Homo-oligomer: A and B are copies of this chain.
Amino acid sequence: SVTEFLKPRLVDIEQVSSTHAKVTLEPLERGFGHTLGNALRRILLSSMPGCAVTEVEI
């Protein structure tokens, strides 16, 4: 019983144009929204593998 927690059901995947998406999840328990949101925000913004231009010379 204690282990049970309301799992979300992935609902919104609204993909405005080709790159701007507005996902929504619900219903989460009291406060899980903030903790998941902040965790995802920090991990996405801080640590995401990728490649970008570093040095340029003329």
Contact = CB atoms under 8 A, between A and B. Distances in A.
Interface of A: 2-3, 5, 29-32, 34-35, 38-39, 42-43, 46-47, 49
11 contacts: A3-B49, A30-B46, A31-B42, A31-B46, A31-B47, A32-B47, A34-B42, A35-B39, A38-B38, A38-B39, A39-B39
A52 to B, nearest CB: 13
Interface centre among A2, A34, A42 (most CB of B within 10 A): A42
Nearest to A45: B31
Contact of A5 (B5, B31, B47): B47
A33 to B, nearest CB: 10
